Enzyme design. Structure first.
Site, PDB file in Angstrom:
ATOM      1  N   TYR A 155      52.404  45.799  45.146  1.00 45.54           N
ATOM      2  CA  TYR A 155      53.102  44.819  44.291  1.00 45.54           C
ATOM      3  C   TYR A 155      54.552  44.622  44.738  1.00 45.54           C
ATOM      4  O   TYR A 155      55.282  45.593  44.934  1.00 45.54           O
ATOM      5  CB  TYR A 155      53.101  45.224  42.809  1.00 45.54           C
ATOM      6  CG  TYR A 155      51.817  45.819  42.266  1.00 45.54           C
ATOM      7  CD1 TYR A 155      50.600  45.161  42.387  1.00 45.54           C
ATOM      8  CD2 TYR A 155      51.839  47.034  41.592  1.00 45.54           C
ATOM      9  CE1 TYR A 155      49.431  45.719  41.876  1.00 45.54           C
ATOM     10  CE2 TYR A 155      50.689  47.590  41.074  1.00 45.54           C
ATOM     11  CZ  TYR A 155      49.490  46.934  41.215  1.00 45.54           C
ATOM     12  OH  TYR A 155      48.350  47.507  40.693  1.00 45.54           O
ATOM     13  N   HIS A 195      51.627  39.843  40.162  1.00 38.46           N
ATOM     14  CA  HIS A 195      51.903  41.002  39.313  1.00 38.46           C
ATOM     15  C   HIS A 195      53.257  40.896  38.614  1.00 38.46           C
ATOM     16  O   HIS A 195      54.031  41.859  38.588  1.00 38.46           O
ATOM     17  CB  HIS A 195      51.817  42.285  40.145  1.00 38.46           C
ATOM     18  CG  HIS A 195      51.390  43.487  39.361  1.00 38.46           C
ATOM     19  ND1 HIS A 195      52.284  44.361  38.786  1.00 38.46           N
ATOM     20  CD2 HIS A 195      50.159  43.959  39.064  1.00 38.46           C
ATOM     21  CE1 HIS A 195      51.620  45.319  38.161  1.00 38.46           C
ATOM     22  NE2 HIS A 195      50.328  45.101  38.319  1.00 38.46           N
ATOM     23  N   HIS A 211      39.425  42.712  34.229  1.00 41.81           N
ATOM     24  CA  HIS A 211      40.177  43.645  34.992  1.00 41.81           C
ATOM     25  C   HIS A 211      39.281  44.829  35.436  1.00 41.81           C
ATOM     26  O   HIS A 211      38.682  45.421  34.622  1.00 41.81           O
ATOM     27  CB  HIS A 211      41.364  44.132  34.169  1.00 41.81           C
ATOM     28  CG  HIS A 211      42.414  44.819  34.951  1.00 41.81           C
ATOM     29  ND1 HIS A 211      43.157  45.856  34.447  1.00 41.81           N
ATOM     30  CD2 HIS A 211      42.852  44.622  36.211  1.00 41.81           C
ATOM     31  CE1 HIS A 211      43.993  46.278  35.371  1.00 41.81           C
ATOM     32  NE2 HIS A 211      43.835  45.537  36.442  1.00 41.81           N
ATOM     33  N   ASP A 246      41.867  52.520  36.837  1.00 43.77           N
ATOM     34  CA  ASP A 246      42.061  53.002  35.465  1.00 43.77           C
ATOM     35  C   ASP A 246      41.153  52.339  34.418  1.00 43.77           C
ATOM     36  O   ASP A 246      41.601  51.670  33.476  1.00 43.77           O
ATOM     37  CB  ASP A 246      43.536  52.999  35.050  1.00 43.77           C
ATOM     38  CG  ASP A 246      44.213  51.661  35.222  1.00 43.77           C
ATOM     39  OD1 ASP A 246      44.171  51.083  36.327  1.00 43.77           O
ATOM     40  OD2 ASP A 246      44.854  51.214  34.252  1.00 43.77           O
TER      41      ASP A 246
HETATM   42 MG   LIG Z   1      46.443  42.447  38.578  1.00 45.99          MG
END
Ligand SMILES: [Mg+2]
Ligand SMILES: [Cl-]
Ligand SMILES: [Mg+2]
EC number: 4.2.1.-
Lengths: 415, 415
Positions: B156, B223, B323, B327
């Protein structure tokens, strides 16, 4: 070289309602700050958010950098904009403001620009099972010097409450409201009838205006209990009674409906005790869809974001009316009031009277004198906590019952 | 007479990332459900929300009433719409869907309306310190049969990562990006340069399209790393490279800026892994300001609200892209995929490959075969947890480092 050395959560219930306070210690002897983190229904999760996450985020940092700490704190878990997250941030943020005032030898309201008024006008809650009992209770508050009152007949949706977790008081169901008949079996919940409630409200205010006149200021809280078009119609029918404001006519999930309400009604509107997200309040204020913003200061993340919200409101001609229930610590009460005293666009301060235990556990509570609050002029928030005395009132824990609200057919409803 | 008897949280990290899974037991011997509650950065607070609040709310109730339990659970604490609250609800919700499938003898995708496709196309992540390294990584994934890839040079904002809490892998900072010079002292943080990052992206895709052609589908994730007008300009300059989508060009706090973006650019846009509130996604979908919705299913409250979001998107011609990072537990991966298989408006499935320990702890992981995922046809979510094996991978806990992102001058930035 001032640094945060320790961050801790204090859980206490001296007024019979679970509170969370954050204490931030520094490497300067005797210098600490206090903040409110009271999301009463989820106190243990808030405690977890502070102790496991905010503490390691903070220790070692210069506490004077309030804005940097807030901006970096808010994004520290990536996901954000929720009531548990915000309350943990608030306890920290208010504590840092408290520390800054103490370092400056100034009350927080003086750091924020100084007094814009000579005292803080308050409203308190009045209730009753019928219009006569409500009237009687208003008379008692007027005798005490209150010039603004909230008038409910049967708490929210006419249902009353038996749940002491809400306001540490049992309140009678509306006596003469006749609900629809339910189906032959009922799923457990606190039953109410939104339509019977809605029709009772103009009758209540007709009686109250008849007996008490138009000098006394009235507030009514819809508390998201009816359909939006029902709320619109209620706002219209209440115009003649000239309420100071009609509160929470819609749920946050239904904010778009205020576009229609505001095309038809001139009853003043307040919204926002439930708000946790800029995308909830910004469209309302940008489009003048409310006259008072009602956020629970700890639940939007503390003094830092509340002052931004107050300024955004001020520039759009919207006034502040911070949430002031029983489920806010005296630290949060002081925080509301420091904002109140320093805001040009202050509207009103909701106030829930405290017992002796709250004043004892939290030395420095605001002086209440004939319907006005008078903050002391001590540095920071002007409030302290006696930790030993706080420990005498352990939190009850558990879950509330009043939030299980069901319409006559048994539908789980926004409470 | 089916009733919930026990609700518990399991915390485990078999893939090197802290996961939270909810197991709901019933009074029918051997019948239980599993749900994902993974908000990795706040797992202990999620655990608290489940164990202290969801557990007493649920014991004794009929698990078949998923919608009633969801609607009543979401308002049970009054305040709502946050990542911790929603994950606790998700764990419960997904487990109830799992139980419903087991009782029905059908996979969740079949309860939802059956298969709408023959397999689930996937995209995976590719990275590298420079253009040639990214290119090599894409070639390796194409050899494994991926037909869609996310292409980043330095993760990012070009910063890379050394924090194993993010994706359990260290990723190189972009080698050839020259940041602006910082001030003479620096506040600790992970420094990046948004403008140097923004200029590097078109150069990356120019190289990648030249070397790899236009058959392969490319995704890029901004992001929330640049100012909104910089994002708009980036979207315009990337039009020629025909991205599958450009992801998160703005923060949730800046969604209004998509109104300007969509007046000027025809690069497909996705948003929403950060969303927790209907007031974030609803204006975007109502005004066709995105082409793909990116919610983390657990973070919006589970299968029940995700299905509503999928339907709302479908009616506005918007497609799903749930998503799919590191995680998320294999239970959440399964939930994403049951939604994927049954949604007419499915767009793509982000996928983070698992290790042997994840497959061992969670029997029933979806079969990955040449760029498509193939769910098993077992009842419910088709997934299980070996609790004894989960206990061999305790959670690391603590706070991440990568979320402290600073621009060259030291400003704390949305990460
Ligand atoms: Mg993303
Ligand atoms: Cl939350
Ligand atoms: Mg209210």
């Amino acid at each position: 070289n001032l640094k945060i050395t320790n961050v801790k959560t204090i859980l206490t219930a001296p007024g019979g309602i679970d509170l969370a306070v954050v204490k931030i210690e520094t490497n300067e002897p005797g210098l600490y700050g206090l903040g409110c983190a009271t999301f009463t229904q989820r106190i243990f999760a808030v405690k977890s958010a502070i102790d496991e996450y905010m503490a390691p985020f903070l220790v070692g940092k210069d506490p004077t950098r309030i804005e940097d700490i807030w901006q970096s704190g808010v994004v520290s878990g990536y996901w954000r904009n929720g009531p548990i997250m915000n309350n943990a941030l608030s306890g920290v943020d208010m504590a840092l403001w408290d520390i800054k005032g103490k370092l400056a030898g100034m009350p927080v309201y003086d750091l924020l620009g100084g007094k814009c008024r000579d005292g803080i006008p308050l409203y308190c809650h009045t209730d009753g099972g019928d219009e006569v009992e409500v009237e009687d209770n208003i008379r008692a508050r007027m005798e005490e010097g209150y010039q603004y009152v909230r008038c409910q007949m049967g708490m929210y949706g006419g249902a009353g409450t038996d749940d002491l977790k809400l306001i540490a008081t049992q309140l009678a169901r509306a006596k003469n409201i006749q609900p629809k008949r339910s189906p032959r079996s009922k799923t457990p919940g606190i039953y109410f009838d939104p339509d019977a409630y809605a029709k009772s409200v103009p009758r209540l205010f007709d009686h109250l205006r008849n007996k008490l006149g138009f000098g006394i200021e009235f507030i009514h809280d819809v508390h998201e209990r009816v359909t939006p078009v029902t709320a619109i119609n209620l706002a219209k029918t209440l115009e003649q009674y000239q309420l100071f404001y009609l509160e929470d006519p819609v749920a946050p999930e239904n904010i778009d409906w205020l576009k229609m309400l505001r095309q038809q009604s001139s009853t003043p509107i307040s919204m926002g005790e439930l708000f946790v997200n800029v995308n909830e309040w910004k469209p309302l204020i940008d489009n003048r869809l409310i006259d008072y913003i009602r956020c629970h200061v700890s639940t939007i993340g503390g003094i830092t974001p509340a002052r931004k919200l107050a300024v955004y409101s001020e520039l759009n001609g919207v006034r502040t009316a911070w949430h002031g229930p029983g489920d806010i610590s005296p630290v949060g009460v002081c925080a509301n009031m420091h904002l109140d005293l320093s805001s040009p666009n202050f509207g009103i301060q909701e106030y829930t009277p405290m017992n002796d235990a709250l004043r004892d556990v939290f030395p420095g509570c605001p002086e209440i004198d004939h319907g006005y609050a008078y903050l002391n002029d001590k540095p920071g928030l002007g409030i302290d906590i006696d930790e030993a005395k706080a420990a005498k009132y352990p939190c009850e824990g558990g879950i509330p019952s009043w939030t299980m609200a069901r319409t006559p057919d048994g539908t789980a409803s926004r409470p």
